[PDB]
Amino acid sequence: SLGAKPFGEKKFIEIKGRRMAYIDEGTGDPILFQHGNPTSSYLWRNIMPHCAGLGRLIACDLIGMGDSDKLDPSGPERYAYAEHRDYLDALWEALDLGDRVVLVVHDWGSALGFDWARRHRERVQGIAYMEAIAMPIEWADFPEQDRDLFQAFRSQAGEELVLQDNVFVEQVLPGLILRPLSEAEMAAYREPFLAAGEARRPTLSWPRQIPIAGTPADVVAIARDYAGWLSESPIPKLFINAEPGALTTGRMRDFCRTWPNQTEITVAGAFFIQEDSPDEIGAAIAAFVRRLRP
């Protein structure tokens, strides 16, 4: 069902000197749900109940996001992919996940999770993904009506748009969900970013990390490495496809459709599809996990 209540209360672990927040419920092998930009563990609140009793249900808040600590001092060089990965790799190590891990990933959670899966492939039981950053892309892969905004985030204008106007929380997120979010849901998504200034830097650094036309070179190389690995890996995969979808003209989807040992389902939504079809997504993930854990 829908609803504004979080799935569980947050726990905290200290990572490299900062507190990271996460949800961890139940017993068994883990099902790891990883949000992206500009969301948090809250994104999964109506999906995780569908997996009750299938294992340990975990949803981490990326550093600087959700209820996780900010990285102070912050500025133009803070919250790159590589820094997020350092914090997330250490958090997932500290959670004692075992070697039968199911990943459920979305948006930048998929770039972090795909890379983690490549480096820890001997421990990964299955991968469910949606709105994946599956490979390096080009500006032509964005619908024409979206290009100006993402070019602006990656220009000097992005600082005013995000640090001052908070447009990723206030405009992009609700604009890429067909259902209008409630005031309570918007308050949950706004909370980590209430303060003008560097509190909002994670939501600007993320669009400045999308691997587009070869830039940034380090994320492009990371995505090339996990794209090649995923295209030949025998790990079970669940590709959740959205209709009508958003922010893509289809080339990445056609690449994902070449990946091995994969089941594809289609659900209704634009980009943050968890807010339009949580029951469809949750039921699909639960069926996938039940097949992996008979």
Answer whether 121's CB lies under 8 Å from 235's CB.
yes
The single residue among 34, 39, 40, 46 that binds K ion, judged by CB under 5 A, is 46
Among the candidate windows 45-53, 68-76, 130-138, 243-251, which touches K ion by CB under 5 A? 45-53
Considering the complex, state which of residue 5 and residue 224 has its C-beta at the smaller distance from K ion: 5
277 binds K ion (CB under 5 A): no
Q: Exposure of 290 by Cβ count < 10 A (0-12 exposed, 13-18 middle, 19+ buried)?
A: exposed
- 128-130-135 Cα angle (round to 5): 100
- Bridge partners, residue 13, by sequence: 20
Q: Exposure of 140 by Cβ count < 10 A (0-12 exposed, 13-18 middle, 19+ buried)?
A: exposed
- 58-277-193 Cα angle (round to 5): 60
Minimum CB distance to K ion, residue 105 (Å): 21
Minimum CB distance to K ion, residue 43 (Å): 13
52 binds K ion (CB under 5 A): no
1 binds K ion (CB under 5 A): yes
Among the candidate windows 39-47, 75-83, 94-102, 152-160, which touches K ion by CB under 5 A? 39-47
Residue 37 tokens read as: 């930009």
Amino acid at 67: D
3 binds K ion (CB under 5 A): yes
Residue 137 tokens read as: 């892309």
Among the candidate windows 1-9, 36-44, 114-122, 173-181, which touches K ion by CB under 5 A? 1-9
Considering the complex, state which of residue 2 and residue 221 has its C-beta at the smaller distance from K ion: 2
Among the candidate windows 29-37, 44-52, 96-104, 269-277, which touches K ion by CB under 5 A? 44-52
Among the candidate windows 3-11, 79-87, 177-185, 214-222, which touches K ion by CB under 5 A? 3-11
Amino acid at 246: A
250 binds K ion (CB under 5 A): no
Answer whether 149's CB lies under 8 Å from 292's CB.
no
DSSP 197: S
Q: What is the C-alpha separation between 114 and 108, in angstroms, rounded?
A: 10
Q: Could you tell me the sign of the dihedral formed by the alpha carbons of 89, 112, 46, 102, in that order? A: negative
27 binds K ion (CB under 5 A): no
Minimum CB distance to K ion, residue 3 (Å): 4
Name residues contacting K ion, limited to 110-149 (CB under 5 A). none
Q: What is the C-alpha separation between 33 and 238, in angstroms, rounded?
A: 13
What is the binding site for K ion (CB under 5 A)? Answer: 1, 3, 46
